Amino acid sequence: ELDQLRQEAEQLKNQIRDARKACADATLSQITNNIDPVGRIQMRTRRTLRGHLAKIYAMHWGTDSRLLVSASQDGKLIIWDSYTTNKVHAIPLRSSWVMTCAYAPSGNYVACGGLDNICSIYNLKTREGNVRVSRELAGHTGYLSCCRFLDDNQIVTSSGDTTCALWDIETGQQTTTFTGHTGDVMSLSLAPDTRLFVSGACDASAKLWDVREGMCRQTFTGHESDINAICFFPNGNAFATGSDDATCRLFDLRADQELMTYSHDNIICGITSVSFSKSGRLLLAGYDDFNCNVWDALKADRAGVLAGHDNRVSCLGVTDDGMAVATGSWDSFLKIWN
Amino acid sequence: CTLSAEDKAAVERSKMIEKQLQKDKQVYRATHRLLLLGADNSGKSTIVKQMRIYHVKTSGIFETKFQVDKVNFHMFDVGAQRDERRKWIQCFNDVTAIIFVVDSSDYNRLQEALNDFKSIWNNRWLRTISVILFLNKQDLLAEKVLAGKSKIEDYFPEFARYTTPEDATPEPGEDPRVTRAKYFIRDEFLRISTASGDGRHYCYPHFTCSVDTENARRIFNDCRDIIQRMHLRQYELL
Amino acid sequence: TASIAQARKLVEQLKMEANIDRIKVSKAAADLMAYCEAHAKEDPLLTPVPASENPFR
Amino acid sequence: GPSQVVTACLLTLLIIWTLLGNVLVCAAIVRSRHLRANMTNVFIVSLAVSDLFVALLVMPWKAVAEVAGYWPFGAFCDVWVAFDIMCSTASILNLCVISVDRYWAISRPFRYKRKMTQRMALVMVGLAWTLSILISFIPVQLNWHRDENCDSSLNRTYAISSSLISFYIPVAIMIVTYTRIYRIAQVQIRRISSLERAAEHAQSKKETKVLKTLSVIMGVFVCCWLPFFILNCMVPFCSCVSETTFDVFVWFGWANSSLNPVIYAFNADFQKVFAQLLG
Ligand SMILES: CC(C)CCC[C@@H](C)[C@H]1CC[C@H]2[C@@H]3CC=C4C[C@@H](O)CC[C@]4(C)[C@H]3CC[C@]12C
Ligand SMILES: CC(C)CCC[C@@H](C)[C@H]1CC[C@H]2[C@@H]3CC=C4C[C@@H](O)CC[C@]4(C)[C@H]3CC[C@]12C
Ligand SMILES: CC(C)CCC[C@@H](C)[C@H]1CC[C@H]2[C@@H]3CC=C4C[C@@H](O)CC[C@]4(C)[C@H]3CC[C@]12C
Ligand SMILES: CC(C)CCC[C@@H](C)[C@H]1CC[C@H]2[C@@H]3CC=C4C[C@@H](O)CC[C@]4(C)[C@H]3CC[C@]12C
Ligand SMILES: CC(C)CCC[C@@H](C)[C@H]1CC[C@H]2[C@@H]3CC=C4C[C@@H](O)CC[C@]4(C)[C@H]3CC[C@]12C
Ligand SMILES: CC(C)CCC[C@@H](C)[C@H]1CC[C@H]2[C@@H]3CC=C4C[C@@H](O)CC[C@]4(C)[C@H]3CC[C@]12C
Ligand SMILES: CC(C)CCC[C@@H](C)[C@H]1CC[C@H]2[C@@H]3CC=C4C[C@@H](O)CC[C@]4(C)[C@H]3CC[C@]12C
Ligand SMILES: CC(C)CCC[C@@H](C)[C@H]1CC[C@H]2[C@@H]3CC=C4C[C@@H](O)CC[C@]4(C)[C@H]3CC[C@]12C
Ligand SMILES: CC(C)CCC[C@@H](C)[C@H]1CC[C@H]2[C@@H]3CC=C4C[C@@H](O)CC[C@]4(C)[C@H]3CC[C@]12C
Ligand SMILES: CC(C)CCC[C@@H](C)[C@H]1CC[C@H]2[C@@H]3CC=C4C[C@@H](O)CC[C@]4(C)[C@H]3CC[C@]12C
Ligand SMILES: CCCN(CCc1cccs1)[C@H]1CCc2c(O)cccc2C1
Ligand SMILES: CCCCCCCCCCCCCCCC(=O)O
């Protein structure tokens, strides 16, 4: 018989529901009461990067805060100079159905993948200058949902096969896999130290992983529905999430629970993407509402809106130095804001 | 202008990349993208092989080029994914059509195919995508009816009520039982498709066997009708 | 059948996630307060820099 | 006094309506990158520019002369005859170009998606304006059109020839193109109706939408222009009709210019952008 394991699991959950309530001496909304709110964040479009044919489905900033990758389902990955709006590279992908791209912290490599189940790594700084595939990381049994480089020889990927994996780029194989999620793993973000990462999935949960122990360390469950986006708060001790729930939620790695929730009665559609400003003070979120809301991260007031898109906001990223946010969309344009 | 040799090289590089993008935009308009769907029994695998006269295995999508009357089609078969469709399907918000394949000979499986069609048809992200139905293995449907086994009513009790549309066009020498059966199952997908979507998308049924060399011609004819109805709606003539 | 090992591995995960040490929500929130107030002076989306400093003008 | 005030009010209202409607079309396109990306809008804005020129360049001065009973703007009368012939012709030729775009799209759907571009749209518009400029300006400046008051009377050869190019050829093209569109729409409606009927039968009028849309498009265009263009041929050939009757049918031709933005630009994508701009 199995049921002793179900009894043990249920009592372990009962213990941790109680342990989280024993930590719940306050709320962020209570201790925030004396904080002076942010002014109305009247940001405006400073560039419009145009040239993609289809819907833009992902983007990522370089650590230099100049360069951008973005990917669209016409099968181009384009590299842009954000200051001059020059196209530095345009890369023909072998499959059209790209769903993620990422750009190395050195600027040497870009990665992307999607419905082909493969992560393709491109070397930008090859001798002949004409860019080409370095390696293809085959081994996931479902489409790639996210990619992040830890360094020029380590990448973490998440997949529709319900797993994450860590790879060695020189070997071209998985050196760890992460398997506690159920349903499709949607989104993924490294901690600032790159020793932890979080992932969110269609099980309506987020999980915290150690990169080298290879195991889940905490699980978070506050969403009533499917999680599309996740991001670390800049201190590394907390993270935000966004979902088909029409809510953002913020969690802390030591309180082990929802610390805050962001919602308004005017919004009922899914959240596609999230990010923080450099101090963590603002949470920026993209929607199926064709626009981005900007939230006071401590108060959960809407501090502003970015309204410049004609179709679903697919991706959103603040620069590594905080000097801008770029937002992509199914309208095929990238807009940069201050 | 104020360009250094470096800024000149960056602008020249940009204009060369823009020249390449502007050329590839012609190819992207000159081709039609099709998503091919259907269960394990459907025979979609034999349809796609038989189309290649018009032209790693663990990868999560397969692609087939074909052309008819100098129009290009790219047909995508999603395979080696998990069975939960609800997320990856959002990529196909902008295909010309979905091709949906059914094994008409499996009365046990046919309600799964109707449920699978219903969740495709009513999907939030597919509100403007028309479906081409291939009601496949019509030879095996003829065999299972002509064998006299007389059992469709065990699965579908309205087949005791149903009688053939006067709009029906049976082929020469087709039996009235075979004809009543093939039009009955067709009209179940018409029951689903005509109930929703207010002329923003349409369903195009065909009776077929996977060996039909006519299947690429059927896709061409329906894509032509799909684009005509789409233009006719912009001008409020539908 | 293999469901015994699946339920057993789940109980090991729930043990490991139960055994982790935890902190009062008041202290956790106060760390986010301290980090925001320390860095808000240097976060250019809150307080716009002039077009001479901004590469995006 | 009373008829002077009444006509001043009515002509002012008609000018302002024509000005506002065509301004809204120009206001919508400039702010909307998706509207600019859809090729068909290049024609709809070109129509609205033609109709905006009728409102600014032509109608106001004739309205002043009608309330006054005399023409004050003497050297301008020769220029005004060119402005009128050009922007009146441009408005008709823009409608004819819109019919050929709609017919190409419906008739040859793959070849349209492949070969239609912002360059192709701009060439079609550029030829409509070019032909309206050439017919008006070269004949008026060469004094080929003529055989205080403004002499708008015409030479017999120029009146007939100008009516063929500006109206009778473009209405023949609009009749052929919209007739073939009606036949293609009837084929698709029979197919749809068959599958709907089979679904209702198994579970156990749309042609009027096509007729309404095409009868508004052809009905408004032919009603306003056809009375004027028939008189425009008769009157110089007879040198047969009272000048008051001629002036009312002239005002019907420009009245079509006010209806043009209602018929062509009230579609839901424009209608959203109007609501979004206006708040
Ligand atoms: C004095 C006469 C000739 C002026 C006639 C007005 C013409 C020049 C106007 C009317 C509508 C206009 C077009 C409206 C929309 C677009 C789409 C945009 O993506 C490029 C410019 C383009 C193609 C415009 C170019 C100029 C245009 C064609
Ligand atoms: C695109 C549109 C808005 C341009 C309009 C330009 C107009 C105002 C210009 C173009 C040609 C001009 C006319 C050309 C010749 C003459 C004859 C002269 O003895 C009196 C002025 C008069 C009558 C001009 C008045 C102004 C005029 C009508
Ligand atoms: C006397 C007047 C009405 C003659 C002008 C007729 C009108 C309808 C003209 C104006 C611009 C013309 C178009 C200009 C360019 C092209 C592209 C070519 O590849 C096919 C024909 C096509 C599409 C032309 C068809 C006729 C056309 C639409
Ligand atoms: C741009 C083109 C295609 C437009 C058509 C121009 C037509 C209307 C032109 C071309 C040649 C012209 C004729 C040339 C010469 C004369 C002699 C003059 O004493 C009276 C007018 C008359 C008889 C002209 C009438 C108008 C005319 C027929
Ligand atoms: C392009 C084709 C289909 C157009 C066919 C109709 C044309 C040719 C018709 C329509 C109106 C007609 C004119 C109407 C009135 C008159 C006055 C009469 O005393 C002599 C003939 C004359 C001058 C006609 C000539 C032919 C005409 C211009
Ligand atoms: C005076 C009257 C009777 C003349 C009628 C002329 C008609 C038949 C002409 C005018 C403009 C023409 C169209 C202009 C452009 C194209 C695009 C081309 O790729 C295929 C033919 C097609 C679609 C033409 C078909 C014939 C057409 C509609
Ligand atoms: C010189 C001009 C003003 C003459 C106008 C004659 C018009 C009204 C005539 C000429 C050709 C006619 C069309 C010829 C064919 C058809 C197809 C039929 O299934 C419905 C009626 C319809 C669409 C006719 C309607 C009336 C019609 C458009
Ligand atoms: C006063 C000036 C502007 C002339 C206006 C005339 C217009 C309003 C007339 C001319 C022809 C008419 C159309 C002729 C035929 C039909 C088909 C019928 O089933 C519904 C009405 C409808 C669609 C009419 C609506 C009004 C109409 C479009
Ligand atoms: C409205 C559209 C569809 C049809 C137009 C039909 C044309 C032929 C009709 C409409 C109004 C008519 C005119 C009305 C009044 C007069 C005054 C009379 O002393 C001579 C005939 C004359 C000048 C008519 C000639 C024919 C005419 C121009
Ligand atoms: C639906 C809208 C566009 C219909 C517009 C109707 C227009 C054509 C009507 C309304 C009032 C009319 C005017 C009323 C009185 C006069 C005085 C007369 O001595 C000459 C004609 C003139 C100046 C008329 C011309 C036609 C006119 C401007
Ligand atoms: C609405 C009609 C405006 N005008 C009429 C000008 C007037 C004459 C008498 C009183 S006011 C015509 C003149 C002739 C012509 C033409 O040959 C070809 C294309 C357009 C036009 C426009
Ligand atoms: C924008 C305010 C109202 C319109 C004022 C200008 C009217 C005359 C010129 C209109 C045509 C030129 C603009 C076409 C659109 C474009 O170039 O993008």
mmCIF file of C-alpha atoms and ligand atoms in Angstrom, chain D residues 29 36-37 41-42 45-46 49 53 118 122 125 129, ligand 1:
data_model
loop_
_atom_site.group_PDB
_atom_site.id
_atom_site.type_symbol
_atom_site.label_atom_id
_atom_site.label_comp_id
_atom_site.label_asym_id
_atom_site.label_seq_id
_atom_site.Cartn_x
_atom_site.Cartn_y
_atom_site.Cartn_z
ATOM 1 C CA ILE D 29 -2.745 57.563 -40.009
ATOM 2 C CA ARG D 36 0.663 52.795 -42.020
ATOM 3 C CA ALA D 37 1.782 49.132 -42.361
ATOM 4 C CA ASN D 41 -4.734 52.861 -45.865
ATOM 5 C CA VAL D 42 -2.378 54.625 -48.352
ATOM 6 C CA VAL D 45 -5.582 58.752 -46.816
ATOM 7 C CA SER D 46 -4.995 59.761 -50.475
ATOM 8 C CA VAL D 49 -6.268 64.427 -48.943
ATOM 9 C CA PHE D 53 -8.228 69.902 -50.950
ATOM 10 C CA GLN D 118 4.312 50.313 -50.092
ATOM 11 C CA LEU D 122 2.460 54.758 -53.751
ATOM 12 C CA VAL D 125 -1.750 56.891 -55.892
ATOM 13 C CA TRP D 129 -2.766 62.539 -58.702
HETATM 14 C C1 LIG E 1 0.009 67.564 -53.907
HETATM 15 C C2 LIG E 1 -0.417 66.082 -53.964
HETATM 16 C C3 LIG E 1 0.374 65.329 -55.055
HETATM 17 C C4 LIG E 1 -0.267 65.413 -52.577
HETATM 18 C C5 LIG E 1 -0.930 64.024 -52.499
HETATM 19 C C6 LIG E 1 -0.802 63.360 -51.108
HETATM 20 C C7 LIG E 1 0.122 62.105 -51.068
HETATM 21 C C8 LIG E 1 1.571 62.502 -51.452
HETATM 22 C C9 LIG E 1 0.035 61.423 -49.654
HETATM 23 C C10 LIG E 1 -1.410 60.954 -49.308
HETATM 24 C C11 LIG E 1 -1.296 59.687 -48.442
HETATM 25 C C12 LIG E 1 0.190 59.590 -48.128
HETATM 26 C C13 LIG E 1 0.725 58.229 -47.630
HETATM 27 C C14 LIG E 1 -0.022 57.763 -46.357
HETATM 28 C C15 LIG E 1 0.672 56.599 -45.687
HETATM 29 C C16 LIG E 1 1.914 56.184 -45.974
HETATM 30 C C17 LIG E 1 2.483 54.932 -45.321
HETATM 31 C C18 LIG E 1 3.876 55.164 -44.701
HETATM 32 O O1 LIG E 1 4.419 53.932 -44.254
HETATM 33 C C19 LIG E 1 4.841 55.800 -45.716
HETATM 34 C C20 LIG E 1 4.247 57.096 -46.314
HETATM 35 C C21 LIG E 1 2.845 56.901 -46.976
HETATM 36 C C22 LIG E 1 3.001 56.016 -48.257
HETATM 37 C C23 LIG E 1 2.251 58.324 -47.330
HETATM 38 C C24 LIG E 1 3.063 59.122 -48.417
HETATM 39 C C25 LIG E 1 2.372 60.416 -48.934
HETATM 40 C C26 LIG E 1 0.906 60.153 -49.372
HETATM 41 C C27 LIG E 1 0.837 59.161 -50.581
#
